[PDB]
Amino acid sequence: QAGVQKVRAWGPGLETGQVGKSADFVVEAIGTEVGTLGFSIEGPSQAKIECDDKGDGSCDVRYWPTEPGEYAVHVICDDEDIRDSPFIAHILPAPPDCFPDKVKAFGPGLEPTGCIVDKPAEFTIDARAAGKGDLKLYAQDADGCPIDIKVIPNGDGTFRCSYVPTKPIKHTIIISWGGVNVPKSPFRVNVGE
Numbered sequence: 774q775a776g777v778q779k780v781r782a783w784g785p786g787l788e789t790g791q792v793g794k795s796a797d798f799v800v801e802a803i804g805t806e807v808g809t810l811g812f813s814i815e816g817p818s819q820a821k822i823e824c825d826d827k828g829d830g831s832c833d834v835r836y837w838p839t840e841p842g843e844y845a846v847h848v849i850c851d852d853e854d855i856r857d858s859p860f861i862a863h864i865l866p867a868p869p870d871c872f873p874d875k876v877k878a879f880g881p882g883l884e885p886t887g888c889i890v891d892k893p894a895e896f897t898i899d900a901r902a903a904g905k906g907d908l909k910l911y912a913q914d915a916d917g918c919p920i921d922i923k924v925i926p927n928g929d930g931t932f933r934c935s936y937v938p939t940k941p942i943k944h945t946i947i948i949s950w951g952g953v954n955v956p957k958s959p960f961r962v963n964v965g966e
């Protein structure tokens with residue numbers, strides 16, 4: 774097994790976030806089982822890290838940095854860090870004008886079911902209630918491939934998004950605002966076909 778990468782972590786919490794909001798990311802395991810893994814956090818607060826198994830070979834991991842600054846996120850497979858562990862995340866003070874919980878995202882292209890290969894998967898993002906922030910999307914299929922999402926701002930605080938899935942496998946989409954995961958996200962989408 775010197776040719777295959779057993780474990781992948783990706784998402785906003787690996788890079789960034791905001792005091793008082795949760796820092797979230799996703800971990801996919803192929804080789805060993807999902808509860809085989811450890812996590813620890815090094816930083817200016819004793820953020821409590823928490824793994825949440827989705828049953829499909831992946832989990833939603835999230836922690837709560839109650840202090841601004843630089844945290845080291847460790848993702849461990851048999852007492853060793855995985856490829857890019859640790860992860861340095863810079864947590865920001867909470868801006869008084871950013872509201873990630875208010876972002877709402879929806880569309881056939883974010884639904885668990887119904888999406889089919891080689892056809893456009895579409896959705897919208899409505900940040901009109903969400904105050905000042907940066908939109909950032911992270912997206913991978915289960916084979917670990919990046920998914921390129923077209924995102925066009927309508928201008929009014931609303932976004933048309935689309936991708937064309939290429940294989941009948943899981944595609945996971947994470948949406949963040951102000952560097953913080955939005956409610957309902959990550960979206961696990963079976964591209965059937």
Ligand SMILES: [K+]
Pocket residue numbers: 857858859860861
């Ligand atoms: K790293």
